[PDB]
From a paper:
Solanezumab (Eli Lilly) and crenezumab (Genentech) are humanised monoclonal antibodies targeting the mid-region of the neurotoxic Aβ peptide34, an early biomarker of Alzheimer's disease pathology and the major component of plaques found in AD-affected brain. We have previously reported the picomolar affinity of solanezumab for soluble monomeric Aβ and wanted to understand the structure of Aβ recognised by solanezumab and how it engages that structure. We have determined the crystal structure of solanezumab Fab complexed to the Aβ peptide (residues 12 to 28) to 2.4 Å resolution by molecular replacement. The structure shown here is the first anti-Aβ antibody structure targeting the central, oligomer-nucleation core.
Residue numbers in the entry:
A (entry chain B): 2 to 52, 52A, 53 to 82, 82A, 82B, 82C, 83 to 123, 129 to 208
B (entry chain A): 1 to 27, 27A, 27B, 27C, 27D, 27E, 28 to 213
C (entry chain C): 16 to 26
The structure:
């Protein structure tokens, strides 16, 4: 059983978005479906609920009259037409059959433009040694940071993105390695910012 | 609207010990077919919620035997046999008897472990960053417990306020420790006007506060 | 796959 969402992303306030879900493996036409959202560090909040055929519909008074849930029982797809978008609609949107929840598509409602980050090394100093990288001034979320093309996973700590007063995001990713290892081993972090199509590989050297 | 009341909202628990999460329903959940549509979900950090228990007591595919569900009518409970390191996450109760499908506030389950002192590290800004007219001074607090820790920035012994932001990682699934990062943001001109850059660390696991410093200029 | 929602029992 799979639920793959699409159509999510950065949107202007007062704008429109339409989320799509490709439901697979379980006879989609037989069951009710829903759209549940989650704002940063918040709980589960239902957005819309449709029945098996599509004759019954429910929306809470937070999205009512602005959002529309729909379904194609022949194509095995679920839709959510979001209109008159507000900053309070910024959340991760999941498509759920209840027992199964998709990966969730992140929706951002902001007038701020897409910006790629600045990648700076957190150089090691003076048998455990700490080093990392600062991923500063990007919008919107998310970024992904891996070390040595995924080979280095042990002792890696990637910190949650903190919004700066400038309205741009920033975070740091750190890794603990033996000091012995330094002289030999080369340390490079792979920073990926899919929203702005930015890819940066930064060598962190003493 | 059928309102689910959860208790406790925060659940710190020792490894291998049992845990119980309470859930009250505002009305009856028994449907015409005889089944009461009350479920339990687990959401670990950065991932989608996963169904554990479905109709009061039945467990889902892949879900262990240690998880268990009980209750009838309004009162319900989710019990764990032995708390494992992989159980850290937010547990949700849910109702699917009536329209709309509702949820509880969520219970954060924490691992209560032995006190671990943090590893403190200070990183000076990069030379490349100084070109753009900004300097970022990062402080790393690695692998500590409890989560509560104080970080103070000192610039030539002068205490800093409102010019630093901190970030904490979620509880680890392997060693159950926390990691903290504090970043001091200063312009190139404000940065170049001072010598001493330190971060004072206060943690339960430290008998005395840990101070890590560097001089700008080497 | 389960009949998660009570509205689907009559289907």
């Amino acid at each position: 059983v799979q639920l793959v969402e699409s159509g999510g992303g950065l949107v202007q306030p007062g704008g429109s978005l339409r989320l799509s879900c490709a439901a697979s493996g379980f006879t989609f036409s037989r069951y009710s479906m829903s759209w549940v959202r989650q704002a940063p560090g918040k709980g589960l909040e239902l957005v819309a609920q449709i029945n098996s055929v599509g004759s019954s519909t429910y929306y809470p008074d937070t999205v009512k009259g602005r959002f529309t849930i729909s379904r194609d029982n022949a194509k095995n797809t679920l839709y959510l037409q979001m209109n008159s978008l507000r900053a309070e609609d910024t959340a991760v949107y999941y498509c759920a059959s209840g027992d199964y929840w998709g990966q969730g598509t992140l929706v951002t409602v902001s007038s701020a433009s897409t910006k790629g980050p600045s990648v700076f090394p957190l150089a090691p100093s003076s048998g455990t040694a700490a080093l990392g990288c600062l991923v500063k001034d990007y919008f919107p979320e998310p970024v992904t940071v891996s070390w040595n093309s995924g080979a280095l996973t042990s002792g890696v700590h990637t910190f949650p993105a903190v919004l700066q007063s400038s309205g741009l995001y920033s975070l740091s990713s750190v890794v603990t390695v033996p000091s012995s290892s330094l002289g030999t081993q080369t340390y490079i972090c792979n920073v990926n910012h899919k929203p702005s199509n930015t890819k940066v590989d930064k060598k962190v050297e003493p | 609207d059928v309102v689910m009341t959860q208790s406790p909202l925060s659940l710190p628990v020792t490894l291998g010990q049992p845990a119980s999460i309470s859930c009250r329903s505002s009305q009856s959940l028994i449907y015409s077919d005889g089944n009461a549509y009350l479920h339990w979900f687990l959401q670990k950090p950065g991932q989608s919620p996963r169904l554990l228990i479905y109709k009061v007591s039945n467990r889902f595919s892949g879900v262990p035997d240690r998880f268990s569900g009980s209750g009838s009518g309004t009162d319900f409970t989710l019990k764990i046999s032995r708390v494992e390191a992989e159980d850290v996450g937010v547990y949700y109760c849910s109702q699917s008897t009536h329209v709309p499908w509702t949820f509880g506030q969520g219970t954060k389950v924490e691992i209560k472990r032995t006190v671990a002192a943090p590893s403190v590290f200070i990183f000076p800004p990069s030379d490349e960053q100084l070109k753009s007219g900004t300097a970022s001074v990062v402080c790393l607090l690695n692998n500590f417990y409890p989560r509560e820790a104080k970080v103070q920035w000192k610039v030539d012994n002068a205490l800093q306020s409102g010019n630093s932001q901190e970030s904490v990682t979620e509880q680890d699934s392997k060693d159950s420790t926390y990691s903290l990062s504090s970043t001091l943001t200063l312009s190139k001109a404000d940065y170049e006007k001072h010598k001493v850059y330190a971060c004072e660390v206060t943690h339960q696991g430290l008998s005395s506060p840990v101070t890590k410093s560097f001089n700008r200029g080497e | 796959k389960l009949v998660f929602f009570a509205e689907d029992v009559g289907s």
